[PDB]
Amino acid sequence: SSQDIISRINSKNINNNDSNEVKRIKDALSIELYPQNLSRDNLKQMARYVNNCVLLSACLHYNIHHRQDILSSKLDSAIVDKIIFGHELNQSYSLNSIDEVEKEILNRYDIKRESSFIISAENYIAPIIGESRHDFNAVVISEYDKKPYVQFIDSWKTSNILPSLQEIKKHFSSSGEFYVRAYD
Ligand code: NA
Numbered sequence: 001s002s003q004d005i006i007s008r009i010n011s012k013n014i015n016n017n018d019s020n021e022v023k024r025i026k027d028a029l030s031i032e033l034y035p036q037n038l039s040r041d042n043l044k045q046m047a048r049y050v051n052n053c054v055l056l057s058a059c060l061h062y063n064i065h066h067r068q069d070i071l072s073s074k075l076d077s078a079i080v081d082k083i084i085f086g087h088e089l090n091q092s093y094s095l096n097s098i099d100e101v102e103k104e105i106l107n108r109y110d111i112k113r114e115s116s117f118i119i120s121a122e123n124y125i126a127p128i129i130g131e132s133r134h135d136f137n138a139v140v141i142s143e144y145d146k147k148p149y150v151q152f153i154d155s156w157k158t159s160n161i162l163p164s165l166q167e168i169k170k171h172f173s174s175s176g177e178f179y180v181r182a183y184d
Contacts, residue, residue, distance in 0.1 A: 002031050002070055008083050021079050028055060030074050034067040040141055043153055044162055045069075047137075053156040057118050057135040058084045060155050064116045064139060065183055077120065077135065081181075089118065089181040098169055101178050102150045105138055109148055115140040116182060119152075123176030131175060136168075138180075 009026050034042050049069040050059045058080050059071035071084070081088045095101050101119060108114045117138045124134030137153040152168050155161055 001066070004086060005029075005031065005071075005084060008086065018076075018079055021075060022083065024052075024075070025055060025080065025083055028052065028073045029059070030072045032070055032072070034069075036067065037142060038064070038067075038139065039143075040151060040162070043139055043141070043151060047153050047155040047161045051155045051158060053154075054080050054135045056155045057137050060137050060153065061116060061118050061183060064137075085183050089183055091120075092180040094177040094179060096177065098152075098165065098172060098178065101138070101180060102165060104180060105140065105150050106148065109140045114182060117180045118182065120179045120181070121172065121176060122178070123172060125171045125173070131173075134171075 009022065009029070014022055034046070043064075046060060046063055046069060050056050050063065050072045052073065052075050054075040054077050055073050058077070059073060062071050062084055063069055078088050092104065095104060098121075105117055108117075119136050119138055121134050121136070123131040126132045126134065134156075136156065139151050139153060140148045141151050142148045150165075152163050152165065153161060154163060154168070157163070160167060
């Protein structure tokens with residue numbers, strides 16, 4: 001798979017309107033197992049390893065999928081997805097709150113055991129700039145004899161890379177859509 005990334009990122013079959021973006025990605029991206037059942041501490045180490053929020057979140061998603069620390073950073077999510085995964089990842093319908101994101105993810109896990117997702121928020125409050133598009137990650141953690149829970153992961157937000165639901169909710173007002181996507 002990582003060799004397919006290398007082929008895509010260096011290819012000449014690219015619309016020149018996308019050239020600078022692909023170059024920014026190529027410049028940032030580095031290419032170098034974790035257990036099948038991840039722990040919260042595993043996720044912390046993976047989030048630290050990878051660290052632009054769209055690139056970071058896609059890198060982390062990829063690493064989680066392969067259970068290995070492969071991609072890191074040293075942007076249109078469609079272009080990023082095409083490079084890292086080889087296609088755009090299919091999205092959910094728009095969701096209206098981070099609470100609803102959590103519920104949808106728990107439902108997907110309940111039915112299909114799908115456990116790792118990229119979240120795209122429209123009106124995330126970033127420092128200084130305010131409401132803005134922001135990507136981050138969510139993984140379902142299953143600890144012994146405990147109900148599965150959603151761990152949000154924001155590898156960009158280095159002050160708190162594993163926020164609680166309460167903490168991440170601080171970064172939203174009622175303004176905003178959310179979308180969930182995942183590599184299959
Ligand atoms: Na926070």
